[PDB]
Amino acid sequence: MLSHMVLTRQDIGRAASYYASEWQGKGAEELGLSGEVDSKRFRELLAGNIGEGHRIMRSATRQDSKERIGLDLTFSAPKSVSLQALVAGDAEIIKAHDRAVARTLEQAEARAQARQKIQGKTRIETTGNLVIGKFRHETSRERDPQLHTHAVILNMTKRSDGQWRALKNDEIVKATRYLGAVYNAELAHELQKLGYQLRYGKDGNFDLAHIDRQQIEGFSKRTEQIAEWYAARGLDPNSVSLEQKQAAKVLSRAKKTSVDREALRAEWQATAKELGIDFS
């Protein structure tokens, strides 16, 4: 799955609460950002502070409006893949998943644009450079093994005149449906090369064959809570509405109890084999 969200001022904390971590992009490499992410410098980049002796971006933003600090492209991996990576503990699947993200974001990067006004007439220009902060997370709200990566695309791209202008967001936003598959297709290719058998269902989606549905929803409690949400309120999973579909975006909440993780994975392991799950 590719979950997206355009990021504003209201979110800057939760945006920083995203710290395993890597930079990616032509926009990042030109600003000299390589290797892991620095929390102080990432928040500087969210806020508009590029540094390197240049002004602060998005000065020409209107004040009635929300200052959007970037775009969150979350690459959420299927359940069966999370279990073989987090419960079995396979680094190869962790490493396969990062590549699906990285190769998908390169196509997102190819779709980067910004606007240039020359004598009162705006021009759209495809820049093809992005400044992305990627953060690999391993759990979910109900702390089910849930591999997902936050691709924070910073609201900046360098133009051909050498300037840092805000990214034109459109052709990335309206390509989320495509990029969700590009992540599907890359990850499927990688697992297929590791010797893993895949079973298919719904949209191009797939699970490992040794992990059937029988033991998937056991680890999909967060989905059981979503499924029970609409079922309480007398409504189908499939015949929902856009926003009304996010009626579970929160309200299926739990307590974010900070827990030890070593004893959790042994819980995973025992909750796995209790479903007879064979990691083969």
Added chain:
DNA sequence: GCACCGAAGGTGCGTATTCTTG
């Protein structure tokens, strides 16, 4: 494309929609 940002021109706005649920 507009209407307000701010110092020239540049900007959010809106866009989005799988399931495993950010």
